[PDB]
């Protein structure tokens, strides 16, 4: 079978980003030894090791949706993957408010329309507790 | 000795997706999306592997892929020059749609949930609309990507200024103004697969403005909606019959029940009633063999049954159904069936749209709202 | 991948021609080939040669021994008593396959000398120097030598290479296949007052030491086949094209102004074919030669085309400008895709013929309009469905018999019937239009550009065919290039319309369900006829209802019969609103004839002609009248005209009369509505109210306002009312009264059209209009009432026919003093005299037509007179006229006339196989078997015509009228 590839964006500190960029544009396999990525079983924490120097990482959710688009002639572009996550290196904490481009900053707060009426999972847990019970008493309340 | 065909009285006045996309192959075009997969629609989380090299916990080296990129580009140029030198069609396999080769750009979206959105494997074009200056003009400011076209009649809602070039994504689904920005100096692109991590740099990232929809998303329980569900199930059944190696072509029912688990089995048996029959005893027992008089449709007929853009419109409808369902009339107006109907009706000139409203995907004065207002 | 059937590869060929003697009709020359053996122990080398006397052959300047035998000279033995045609077809196919260069074979077998075997085993070059002589050629080179005295340039004598396909073996020894590409060096030593035109570019022209002869040196660096090499030697008037400067036009003397006017359009044809394809013209020059007594009307070779002089017209000649224009266009299309990109086998010929015909149709679309394109495509499709339902079918791309339903073998081009060759090219370009319908036109032009670009990168290498075989296209390579540019493969369409040899027949009938508002179509196929096949694909149908025009796709599987499609509202009959058409416009329709319960106005099954089909739809007559009036498609207007002949109601007369009065209708629809109105008027006699049909309309459109019976003076500058004016009396003469005689109101009208004709004021000639007037006079002739077989003399002539006979006598005699453009009035008057002889008016005497069929007349007069003699010997069962025609087939100077006599005697045979006739002797069977076996051994087109004549007369089995 075929499994859709999973692309994400890696953001590094600027000096380490310059060393990683120089090693990528060089093209040797020396970069392979220099750059490693260890993702912790939390799922939202990691180490990126640049030149064997550990950096602390967080995998965050991006507010917009990006899409990688490949081309052969630079006139027709084929969508290859959807990017929604970034492993910035240096829950509410795992949500990034800004977008990658310069015009998109504070997009989640300002350029996103918010419509409102985790919570569903809590309601399911409450229903399960009511089922495991015997007698349930309920009242919409006031200030108390 | 001349034309002599009164042609002015008789006659008074393109996107090629990949072969995995036009054949609706199941990684790229899913048969069924559950609730947690509809909430993560076009935002796929980073899954943990169970088997593979990355499934073992620990540090993992990323691998540079610049010999791979230039080897694949040189190989594709050899293929193109061996085929006569014209423009070629290359995306014929799923392994052509990897990010490991070709010139990648990124495309960011301004809206959170657009009315239409491309699946993986589908093609789009970049058109540079350039309105000439009044009288003399130097020529279109040249651009790295896309082809230039001179637009007297603005494609979008507004009109282009004289001497203004605007790039845009153009396909069958939408048309949307894009804006080229340079990448941040810190961000790279990591393509992870089961075997390891791979790293590219990116240099070009477009910002996609508010989409102008060219395809109408159907409503829930619509006639077009139920027709697409039935035709998608029929196409999947035909492609399972084509994949069958048995000389009387035969399929199993629980393959279809694995693909479409929300379907009642009466509908699946309705699709299998014509074109198949159930064998209970003897050979082919508990199989749905193909009827001997039934001609299984060819590949182009199956492609003419369902289009990929209809699948994208259906996925937009069911994702918006989930988001509305989770959030308990203003929200209903912002549903893509309403907004796509409003915009396409405004483009024929049926009705007008209030450009300031609640269907505004920004939530501020920027951006349009596609909801119908009477022309009076 | 191309692997040669020959064990050698030919690199270069020198063709030198000396001593072209026009008095003795003789050439002398040599040929030097440069072959590289690919297999060791080559021993014999087999070359192609017909009619050339081989003097000596030297291989690497060593004397070699050759043996010559041609099995196609006498196909079957003289002392075999077989007389069936299947025996001759198998023996003729085996004989042509025994001289085939597409196998390893050939007619001249040269033995390599012994001392060169150590030169041939380790594969080194061999230079074969044959010198030959054509003593008095019966094929290949045609010598047109007139019998005026003077020098050969002063009398207008010329030579040209004639023939079709691989016929270059007829004038020098070669490897006469389309797959043996080599570079060429061509020298011709001609008279000092003559010019030698050939392929390549002329590098120099040196004089001889007496300065009485000069040698033309041509060089061809683009590797062409031997079959694309031509020659035209004559006293030609040279004209350089004033727009494109590598193009030279050669004409016969005294025809330079006609050449200037005629070849003035060709730069636009060049510009079209170089902008739809993106390759420039591949050869370095282009030469158009106009000659007399041509083989075909247009032949295309490498960097050269040979047309007949009968295409040359002046500025005041209309009705000939489009025909000559499209002959030039198809010669240039074959320059691109028959001569530069060549054929890999005899299969894959459909690819080249289809690409040539398809890009020529694109030229016709741009030049003459989309409506003329649709009319041309419909007439080609009707041609092929008529031919394939008549006899078997045309099989593009056979696999090697594959087609055993037809009396010849399709393995070689020289065994094909000529009608099969014509229908082959026709079906090839229609199947290419179908491939454009599946895969869009821009991808199609990209396929053609990829083929041309591979060929032009191949054309500049020097490697001897390591890369020169990329200039040869195949079917698999063409389908692979299509799959490369588009990603779709056309293998079901290729399997249906190429590999399978049949057309489809559709019988449709509808019924409107008022309750559920649906339209129940009923489409059934006739798949048991001999020419037919079964269609299982999708099918487009276009329904015009009151809400507009809607397209529907129907899936027509084998067990399908009823197709229910949905119908829209009828709210445009509640309010008067305009009904929107197939294009964006909308019109006011008179809905009084429509049914009250059905919204649908007309239905068209397969409107875009997307299959090779013959549709028989059963509409109601008002639906045919609405489709004639308000449709924006010319093929639907033509098919509604064709279907209105079965409904002679006065509403159909009103529909055709409204079509005739209507400018902004396509003119070829009105020209058909004339004949349809004539047929309808003949069928509703004793109901017709006023004057005869189209007469008042003719006086309203083309006569004076103050005088109705005087026609306006001729001004032919509109070109659509000219064609309608010259076609309306021809249809008006088919009117008949209750007594079955043409009325004296229409005959008097035609005679007044003839008398009051004044042409001193237009800038165009009157020959076609006057010729059509003679055709209208011939249409009015009804059979005479002979009593007791009374001899037809001058006193018992019809009083109607005496006026007609006086007019055609005046016209023919005035043509003898003031001739027309191509003796069009001679052809029309001979045709009218044959019409008067076919009825009992003029005595049935063939002596006039036998005097007009002599050699010195123009070729149009000759073929009209020979058509009259063929019709006479069919009706009068004349033995001596049939012997006259068979003698004229055997020894006539013009081979086109011989082919035309065999063609006309096949189309209008003196007897068929079913008839008992007095002309069914053993003597006639022996004459026609001798004409198939020997006698026609020099042309390859007379022999297939003799096979067709023997099939038409005696059938596939043993001639019955025999011991």
UniProtKB/Swiss-Prot annotation, chain A:
Localization annotation: Nucleus
Biological processes, Gene Ontology terms: chromatin organization; DNA-templated transcription initiation; estrogen receptor signaling pathway; mRNA transcription by RNA polymerase II; negative regulation of DNA-templated transcription; negative regulation of MHC class I biosynthetic process; negative regulation of MHC class II biosynthetic process; negative regulation of protein kinase activity
Key words of the record: Coiled coil, Nucleus, Phosphoprotein, Transcription, Transcription regulation, Ubl conjugation
Example of a GO MF term: protein heterodimerization activity
GO cellular component: cytoplasm; male germ cell nucleus; MLL1 complex; nucleoplasm; nucleus; transcription factor TFIID complex; transcription factor TFTC complex; transcription regulator complex
Modified residues (Phosphoserine): 128
Taxonomic superkingdom: Eukaryota
Post-translational modification: Phosphorylated by CIITA. Ubiquitinated by TRIM26; leading to proteasomal degradation.
Keyword DNA damage: no
Expression sites by tissue: Ubiquitous.
Claim: Flavoprotein is one of the keywords in the record: no
Family membership: Belongs to the TAF7 family.
Quaternary data: Component of the TFIID basal transcription factor complex, composed of TATA-box-binding protein TBP, and a number of TBP-associated factors (TAFs), including TAF1, TAF2, TAF3, TAF4, TAF5, TAF6, TAF7, TAF8, TAF9, TAF10, TAF11, TAF12 and TAF13. Part of a TFIID-containing RNA polymerase II pre-initiation complex that is composed of TBP and at least GTF2A1, GTF2A2, GTF2E1, GTF2E2, GTF2F1, GTF2H2, GTF2H3, GTF2H4, GTF2H5, GTF2B, TCEA1, ERCC2, ERCC3, TAF1, TAF2, TAF3, TAF4, TAF5, TAF6, TAF7, TAF8, TAF9, TAF10, TAF11, TAF12 and TAF13. Interacts with TAF1; the interaction is direct.
Name assigned to this protein: Transcription initiation factor TFIID subunit 7
Gene that specifies this protein: TAF7
Portion held of the full protein: 9 to 187 of 349
UniProtKB/Swiss-Prot annotation, chain B:
Modification after translation (UniProt): Phosphorylated by casein kinase II in vitro.
Signal peptide limits: none
Region (Histone acetyltransferase (HAT)): 1-376
Documented effect of changing residue 77 to K: In a metastatic melanoma sample; somatic mutation
Outcome (variant: residue 147 to Q): 25% decrease in histone acetylation
Location relative to the cell: Nucleus
Subunit structure: Component of the TFIID basal transcription factor complex, composed of TATA-box-binding protein TBP, and a number of TBP-associated factors (TAFs), including TAF1, TAF2, TAF3, TAF4, TAF5, TAF6, TAF7, TAF8, TAF9, TAF10, TAF11, TAF12 and TAF13. Interacts with TAF7; the interaction is direct. TAF1, when part of the TFIID complex, interacts with C-terminus of TP53.
Family statement: Belongs to the TAF1 family.
Function summary: The TFIID basal transcription factor complex plays a major role in the initiation of RNA polymerase II (Pol II)-dependent transcription. TFIID recognizes and binds promoters with or without a TATA box via its subunit TBP, a TATA-box-binding protein, and promotes assembly of the pre-initiation complex (PIC). The TFIID complex consists of TBP and TBP-associated factors (TAFs), including TAF1, TAF2, TAF3, TAF4, TAF5, TAF6, TAF7, TAF8, TAF9, TAF10, TAF11, TAF12 and TAF13. TAF1 is the largest component and core scaffold of the TFIID complex, involved in nucleating complex assembly.
Comment on protein domains: The Bromo domain mediates interaction with histones that have acetylated lysine residues at specific positions. The second domain also recognizes and binds histones that are butyrylated and crotonylated.
Protein's recorded name: Transcription initiation factor TFIID subunit 1
Species annotation: Homo sapiens
UniProtKB/Swiss-Prot annotation, chain C:
Compartments, as annotated in UniProt: Nucleus
Distribution of this protein across tissues and organs: Expressed in all tissues tested.
Keywords assigned: Disease variant, Intellectual disability, Nucleus, Phosphoprotein, Transcription, Transcription regulation
Record GO cellular component, one term: transcription factor TFTC complex
Keyword Transcription regulation: yes
Gene Ontology molecular functions: chromatin binding; RNA polymerase II general transcription initiation factor activity; transcription cis-regulatory region binding
GO biological process, one term: RNA polymerase II preinitiation complex assembly
Family affiliation: Belongs to the TAF2 family.
Further information: PubMed:9418870 was unable to show an association between TAF2 and TFIID.
Linked pathology: Neurodevelopmental disorder with feeding difficulties, thin corpus callosum, and foot deformity: An autosomal recessive disorder characterized by impaired intellectual development, microcephaly, delayed psychomotor development, pyramidal signs, thin corpus callosum, and foot deformity.
Self-association state and partner proteins as the record states: Component of the TFIID basal transcription factor complex, composed of TATA-box-binding protein TBP, and a number of TBP-associated factors (TAFs), including TAF1, TAF2, TAF3, TAF4, TAF5, TAF6, TAF7, TAF8, TAF9, TAF10, TAF11, TAF12 and TAF13. Interacts with TAF2C1. Component of the TFTC-HAT complex.
The protein's role, per its UniProt record: The TFIID basal transcription factor complex plays a major role in the initiation of RNA polymerase II (Pol II)-dependent transcription. TFIID recognizes and binds promoters with or without a TATA box via its subunit TBP, a TATA-box-binding protein, and promotes assembly of the pre-initiation complex (PIC). The TFIID complex consists of TBP and TBP-associated factors (TAFs), including TAF1, TAF2, TAF3, TAF4, TAF5, TAF6, TAF7, TAF8, TAF9, TAF10, TAF11, TAF12 and TAF13. TAF2 forms a promoter DNA binding subcomplex of TFIID, together with TAF7 and TAF1.
Record's protein name: Transcription initiation factor TFIID subunit 2
Residues of the full protein shown: 19 to 988 of 1199
